[PDB]
Amino acid sequence: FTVAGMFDGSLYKLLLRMALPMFVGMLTQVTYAIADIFWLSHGIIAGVGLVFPVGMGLFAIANGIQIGMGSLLSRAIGMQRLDRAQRILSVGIIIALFFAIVITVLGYVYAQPLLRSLGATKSIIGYATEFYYYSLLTVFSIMLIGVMMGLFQGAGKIMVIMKASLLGALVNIMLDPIMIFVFDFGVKGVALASFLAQLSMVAYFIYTLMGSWKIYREFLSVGMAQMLMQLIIAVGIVIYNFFIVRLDVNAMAAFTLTGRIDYFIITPMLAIATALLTVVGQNWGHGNVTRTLNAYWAAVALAFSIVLVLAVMHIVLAPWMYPLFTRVVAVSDYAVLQTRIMALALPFVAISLLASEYYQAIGKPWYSVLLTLMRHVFISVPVVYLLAIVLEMRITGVYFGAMSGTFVAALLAWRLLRLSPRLLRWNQEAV
Numbered sequence: 001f002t003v004a005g006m007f008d009g010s011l012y013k014l015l016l017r018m019a020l021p022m023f024v025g026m027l028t029q030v031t032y033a034i035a036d037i038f039w040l041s042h043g044i045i046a047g048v049g050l051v052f053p054v055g056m057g058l059f060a061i062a063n064g065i066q067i068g069m070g071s072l073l074s075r076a077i078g079m080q081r082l083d084r085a086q087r088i089l090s091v092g093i094i095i096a097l098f099f100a101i102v103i104t105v106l107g108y109v110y111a112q113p114l115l116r117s118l119g120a121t122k123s124i125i126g127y128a129t130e131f132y133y134y135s136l137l138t139v140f141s142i143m144l145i146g147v148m149m150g151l152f153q154g155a156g157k158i159m160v161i162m163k164a165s166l167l168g169a170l171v172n173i174m175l176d177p178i179m180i181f182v183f184d185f186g187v188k189g190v191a192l193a194s195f196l197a198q199l200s201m202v203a204y205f206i207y208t209l210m211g212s213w214k215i216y217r218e219f220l221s222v223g224m225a226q227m228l229m230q231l232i233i234a235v236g237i238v239i240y241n242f243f244i245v246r247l248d249v250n251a252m253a254a255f256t257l258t259g260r261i262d263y264f265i266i267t268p269m270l271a272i273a274t275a276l277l278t279v280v281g282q283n284w285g286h287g288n289v290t291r292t293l294n295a296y297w298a299a300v301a302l303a304f305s306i307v308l309v310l311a312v313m314h315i316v317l318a319p320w321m322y323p324l325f326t327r328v329v330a331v332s333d334y335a336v337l338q339t340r341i342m343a344l345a346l347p348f349v350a351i352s353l354l355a356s357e358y359y360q361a362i363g364k365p366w367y368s369v370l371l372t373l374m375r376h377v378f379i380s381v382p383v384v385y386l387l388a389i390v391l392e393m394r395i396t397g398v399y400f401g402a403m404s405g406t407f408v409a410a411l412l413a414w415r416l417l418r419l420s421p422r423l424l425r426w427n428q429e430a431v
C-alpha cells in the first residue's frame with residue numbers, strides 16, 4: 001500500500017521509480033508481435049488481420065476499467081480508508097463482469113453486420129467469423145486483466161505489473177513453438193499461446209493478490225471517460241487519413257511507415273502518465289493539492305525532456321532511415337517531410353496528455369475529455385481545412401494544421417493546472 005516516498009519524497013525519484021517498471025512492462029508487449037511473426041515464418045488464414053481491430057477495441061475498454069480502478073482506489077488509499085478500497089475492488093470487479101457479458105452477447109448477435117463493416121468475404125470470412133468468435137472468448141479474461149492492472153497500479157505496486165509482464169512474454173515465447181510443432185495447431189496455435197500467456201498474467205496477479213450508485217457512478221464516469229478519449233483519438237487518426245489519402249496516396253503510404261516509430265517515441269510519456277495517476281490520486285486523497293500540482297509539473301519535465309530527445313533523433317535519423325524502407329521516393333520523401341515538420345510537436349503532447357491524467361486522478365474527467373478534444377478535433381479540423389484546401393498548401397497544410405491543436409491544448413493545460421479556489425474547494429468537498 002505504502003509506496004515509499006509518495007507524500008514527503010522527491011517527486012522525480014518517486015515518478016521515475018514507478019515509471020520505469022511500467023516501461024519495461026510496455027516493452028515486453030512488443031515481444032508478442034516479434035516472437036509471433038518469428039514462429040509464423042514456419043495468404044488464406046490471413047483474415048486473422050481482419051479481426052485485429054476488435055482486439056484493440058477490447059483493450060481500450062480494458063484500459064477504461066484500469067484507470068477507473070486506479071483512479072478510485074488510489075484516492076481511497078490516500079484518505080486512508082481501506083474500506084472504500086475493498087468496496088471499490090468489488091464494484092470494479094462487477095463492472096468488469098457486466099462489461100464482459102453485454103460485450104460478448106451483443107457481439108455474438110450482431111456478429112455478421114460487424115464483420116461486414118470490417119473486411120470483404122470473396123476469400124476470407126469463415127476464417128474471419130471463426131476468429132471473431134475466439135476473440136469474443138477472450139473478453140472476460142481481458143476485463144479481468146484490466147481490473148488487476150488498476151488494482152496494483154492504484155496501490156502503487158508496479159513491480160508486480162512488470163513481473164507479470166515478463167512472465168507473460170516468456171510463456172508466449174515458449175508455447176508458440178510447442179503449439180506449432182507438438183500440437184500442429186498453426187496460426188490458431190500462436191493465438192492460443194498468446195491467450196494462455198495473458199492468463200498466466202491474471203494467474204500471477206491473483207496469486208500475488210492472495211496475501212451504492214454513487215460509487216458505481218464514480219467508477220463508471222472515470223472509466224467511460226477513458227474509453228471516450230480512446231475513441232476520440234481513434235477518430236483523429238481517421239480524419240487525418242481521410243485528408244491525406246484524398247490528397248496524395250503516397251502521403252498515406254508514408255504515414256503507414258512512420259506510425260510505429262511515432263508511437264514508440266510517445267510511449268515513455270505514457271509510462272510517466274501511469275505513474276502520475278497514482279501519485280496525484282494518493283496525494284489528492286491525502287488533501288495535499290500543492291504536491292499534486294507539483295507532481296504534474298515534475299512529470300511534464302521528465303516526459304518533455306525524454307520525448308524531446310527522441311523526436312530530435314527521429315529527425316536526424318529520418319532522411320537516412322526512410323529511403324531504406326521503401327523504393328517509392330515521394331513516399332519516403334513525404335515520410336521525411338512529415339517527420340521534419342511534425343516531430344517537435346511531440347514533446348508538447350506531454351503537457352495536454354499528462355493534464356488529462358491529472359483530471360482523471362482527481363475524478364474530474366470532463367476536463368480530460370475536453371483537453372483530448374482540444375488536441376484532436378476542435379482546432380486541427382478547421383485549420384487543416386483552411387491551410388490544405390482553402391489556402392492552396394496541400395499535404396503540407398495537413399502536416400501543420402494537424403499539430404496546431406497540440407499546441408493549443410498545451411496552452412490550456414498550462415492555464416488550468418495551478419492553485420485556484422475551484423481546485424482547492426474540489427479537494428475539500430472530496431475529503
Ligand SMILES: C[As](C)(=O)[O-]
Nearest residue numbers: 422423425426429
Ligand atoms: C460547480 As463546481 C463542481 O465546477 O465547483
Ligand SMILES: [Rb+]
Nearest residue numbers: 262342402403
Ligand atoms: Rb500525431
